[PDB]
Structure 1
Amino acid sequence: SGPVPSRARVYTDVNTHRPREYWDYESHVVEWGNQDDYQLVRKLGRGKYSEVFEAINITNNEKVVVKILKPVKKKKIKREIKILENLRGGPNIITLADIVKDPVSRTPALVFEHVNNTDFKQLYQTLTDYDIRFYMYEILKALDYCHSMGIMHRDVKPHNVMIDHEHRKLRLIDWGLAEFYHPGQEYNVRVASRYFKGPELLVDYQMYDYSLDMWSLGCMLASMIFRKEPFFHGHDNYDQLVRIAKVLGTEDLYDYIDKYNIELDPRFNDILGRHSRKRWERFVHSENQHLVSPEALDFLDKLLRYDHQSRLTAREAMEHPYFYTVVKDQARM
């Protein structure tokens, strides 16, 4: 008949057990601050869909980052605000410091803790084996945390991971696509950037969960250990699934379609073809062999699964052998 329902393996009912006000972001009332407490210093390079600035809080001379919320549904604005407030103080989550409106313009803006504008994309193709493990483990802290708090990020990519490499600090940013997980809810599949979209988004399976973020993490990991940016390099959303099909194989893809009774968009009929599941060794060469190990491949393999239920949870990922020396070293500090 229709698609078969799905529920998250972990943290399934955490928002149900909360008070209504925790997740019911439409009912949130914002005390809007005054943007004249802040003065914009300079525009930060964040691509074409960004109004992000370094600024100075003139009450205490403290550096901050300001994000002007581009015209968008008021629904989205309260959602990002409520998520950031709910996650405030969590491991490697960017800290929302203030919420303000321009007196004249009335345009809302978010004020964050200062970070340097050095994202993971700029660093992540030049890391040692150890540093890939270290920063992957730091990202997993943020993901396990937000998932445990009933929230999925939905836009996990190198550009949304801010790194202070000198201080070995990491912050997960841009919660503008993040959503509260509710069992049985059918979500918008037009989320994330093409190269990091999970198969669920690509085949239009709407009843997804936290596991979406773990596919994204998998693409990031593959990119780093194989030095291939992006790992799945599609021309468009349809070809994106074909790129994945050529690595993961068509057998697991079609079993996944059958398991959830997904109605596959007719454009896929000719382009998917028939492909074996490729061994990861295929991608290893002399310029990346130092980043690739049995532990890394075993870990990667357990992230990049068509079936969202089969993927490691963030906490399961953190327990993998790949991270043992990171866990050991962390206990010593």
Structure 2
Amino acid sequence: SKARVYADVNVLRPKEYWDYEALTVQWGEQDDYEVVRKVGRGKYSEVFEGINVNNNEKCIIKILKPVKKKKIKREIKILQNLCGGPNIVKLLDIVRDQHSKTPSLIFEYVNNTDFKVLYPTLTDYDIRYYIYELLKALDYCHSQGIMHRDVKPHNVMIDHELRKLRLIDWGLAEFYHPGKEYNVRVASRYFKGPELLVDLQDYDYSLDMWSLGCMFAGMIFRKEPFFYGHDNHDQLVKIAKVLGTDGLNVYLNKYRIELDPQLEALVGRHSRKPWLKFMNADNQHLVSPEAIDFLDKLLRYDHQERLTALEAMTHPYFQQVRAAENS
């Protein structure tokens, strides 16, 4: 299996561009930067509102937890190649503690409101706006030969006052090479596509589109997370109860995959559940037939059938967002 678009990007570019292990970091002044208050926490890092002492400018200070050097160079090389692109977070400087040598990535300052508090308040149009903006980041990165692999709400920063969006946390992103076999333990359980759940390792840019589709479904149905599994196996069951098992079997036979007895017995047999059955009084103001048509084309077992970021931006669901930009 190979990407239907942008398959040769890295093929045509200098090795330096995609070869991140040969990277040698140029560090800066740690004391240029001061912490003011914590704003985030993760298994891989801690995040802080900071100050640049030189120019008295606000910034983002991300302090990384002890981790392998290769992962940290990868994220840095990717941030550099993406710097400047639409809606992507900007790496400004890189520093580290002398004594313990824990590194810190300094970014352009970004404002955010927790999504659990922000999503309940979003309008029909807001959702088209912010998704379009997100799709512009995704098409940019894919066009530069990169997969993000961790798309989910906590990774999209939104300053709703300025209606500015930034895709963050590039700690799990990778470069794409035709035929290459990737690691399936990427992304949050709730946002993992079927390829990651049936061990199909030669995935491509379309992984990100599945995750996007899950994010979108949670938003329009006001059910977050949309597919809510307690473990990986539970996750695939939850999906199969929605898309149906016929599509699953077709998918498995085309790539010639076979599920192990445990999972297979659990999946069982289920007829498709029509998207309309998910509409209720709590989300009725968000669900439209165009949103449904869009969503339908994103959540497809077969990664090769899924819309690209570029085709997706040309969907009529976004027709008004586009017209507002052409002026």
Q: TM-score range by the shorter chain?
A: over 0.9
Tell me the SS of whatever aligns to 1:240: helix
Given the alignment of the two structures, is residue 178 of structure 1 paired with residue 197 of structure 2, yes or no?
no
Partner of 2:62: 67
Tell me the SS of whatever aligns to 2:106: strand
Given the alignment of the two structures, is residue 107 of structure 1 paired with residue 65 of structure 2, yes or no?
no
* Structure 1 position 71, deviation (Å): 1.1
Choose the corresponding residue for 1:133, options 128, 131, 135: 128
Given the alignment of the two structures, is residue 167 of structure 1 paired with residue 162 of structure 2, yes or no?
yes
Partner of 1:3: none
* Structure 1 position 124, deviation (Å): 2.3
Kept after mapping to 2: 8 A contact 1:55/1:64: yes
For 2:46, give the aligned amino acid.
Answer: E
* Structure 1 position 307, deviation (Å): 0.6
* Structure 1 position 67, deviation (Å): 1.0
* Structure 1 position 45, deviation (Å): 2.6
Kept after mapping to 2: 8 A contact 1:120/1:160: no
Tell me the distance in 1 between the aligned counterparts of 2:264 and 2:290.
36
Partner of 2:9: 14
Structure 1 residue runs without a partner (length 5+): 1-5
Tell me the distance in 2 between the aligned counterparts of 1:122 and 1:266.
42
Choose the corresponding residue for 2:261, options 239, 250, 266: 266
Choose the corresponding residue for 1:206, options 184, 192, 201: 201
Superposition RMSD in Å? 1.1
Choose the corresponding residue for 2:143, options 148, 162, 185: 148
Choose the corresponding residue for 2:306, options 289, 311, 323: 311
* Deviations, residues 26-76 of structure 1 (Å, cap 9, x unaligned): 001111112111111111133454311111111111111011121111000
Choose the corresponding residue for 1:322, options 317, 324, 327: 317
Given the alignment of the two structures, is residue 254 of structure 1 paired with residue 249 of structure 2, yes or no?
yes
Tell me the SS of whatever aligns to 1:159: helix
* Structure 1 position 119, deviation (Å): 4.6
For 1:137, give the aligned amino acid.
Answer: Y
Tell me the distance in 2 between the aligned counterparts of 1:111 and 1:265.
45
Tell me the SS of whatever aligns to 2:170: coil
Kept after mapping to 1: 8 A contact 2:113/2:159: yes
* Structure 1 position 122, deviation (Å): 3.6
Kept after mapping to 1: 8 A contact 2:146/2:174: yes
Partner of 2:231: 236
Gap change, CA 1:121 and 1:208, over 3 Å in 2: farther
* Structure 1 position 290, deviation (Å): 1.3
Greater RCO (Cα-Cα under 8 Å, separation 6 or more) = 1
For 1:76, give the aligned amino acid.
Answer: K
Kept after mapping to 2: 8 A contact 1:221/1:300: yes
Mean Cα deviation higher: 205-214 or 117-126 = 117-126
Given the alignment of the two structures, is residue 216 of structure 1 paired with residue 242 of structure 2, yes or no?
no
Partner of 1:23: 18
Tell me the distance in 2 between the aligned counterparts of 1:53 and 1:233.
30
Tell me the distance in 1 between the aligned counterparts of 2:199 and 2:174.
17
Kept after mapping to 1: 8 A contact 2:46/2:62: yes
**Percentage of matched positions with identical amino acids:** 76
For 2:71, give the aligned amino acid.
Answer: K
Tell me the distance in 2 between the aligned counterparts of 1:121 and 1:326.
25
For 1:258, give the aligned amino acid.
Answer: N
Aligned 1:67-86 pairs, distance under 5 A: 67-86=62-81
Kept after mapping to 2: 8 A contact 1:121/1:159: no
* Deviations, residues 244-279 of structure 1 (Å, cap 9, x unaligned): 001101001111111111132332121101111111
Kept after mapping to 1: 8 A contact 2:129/2:321: yes
Aligned length: 327
Kept after mapping to 1: 8 A contact 2:44/2:64: no
Tell me the distance in 2 between the aligned counterparts of 1:8 and 1:288.
35
* Deviations, residues 73-118 of structure 1 (Å, cap 9, x unaligned): 1000110000000000100000000011112221111110001132
For 2:29, give the aligned amino acid.
Answer: N
Tell me the distance in 1 between the aligned counterparts of 2:10 and 2:166.
24
Tell me the distance in 1 between the aligned counterparts of 2:226 and 2:67.
32
Structure 2 residue runs without a partner (length 5+): none
TM-score norm. by structure 2 comes to 0.98
Misfit runs of 4+, over 6 Å: none
Tell me the distance in 1 between the aligned counterparts of 2:247 and 2:120.
30
TM-score norm. by structure 1 comes to 0.96
